[PDB]
Amino acid sequence: LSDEDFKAVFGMTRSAFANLPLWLQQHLKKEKGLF
Ligand code: NA
């Protein structure tokens, strides 16, 4: 997805998401039905 769609889904930038721990990245992907 686009940078704008990413920010809408996750409410943060891709760089912000990458600073999260893996467990939380994975948690968010599942919560949102993505990836
Ligand atoms: Na929106």
- Give 14's contacts (C-beta < 8 A, 6+ positions apart): 3, 6
- Give 31's contacts (C-beta < 8 A, 6+ positions apart): none
Ligand 1 is an ion; its neighbours by CB within 5 Å are 8
Q: How far apart are CA 21 and CA 5, in angstroms?
A: 21
Domains with residue ranges and CATH for the chain: 3-32 (1.10.950.10)
**6 Cα–ligand 1 center, Å:** 10
Resolution in Å equals: 1.5
**4 Cα–ligand 1 center, Å:** 9
**30 Cα–ligand 1 center, Å:** 20
> Experimentally, how was this structure solved?
X-ray
C-alpha to C-alpha distances, 2 to 5, 6, 12, 21, 23, nearest whole angstrom: 5, 6, 13, 22, 23
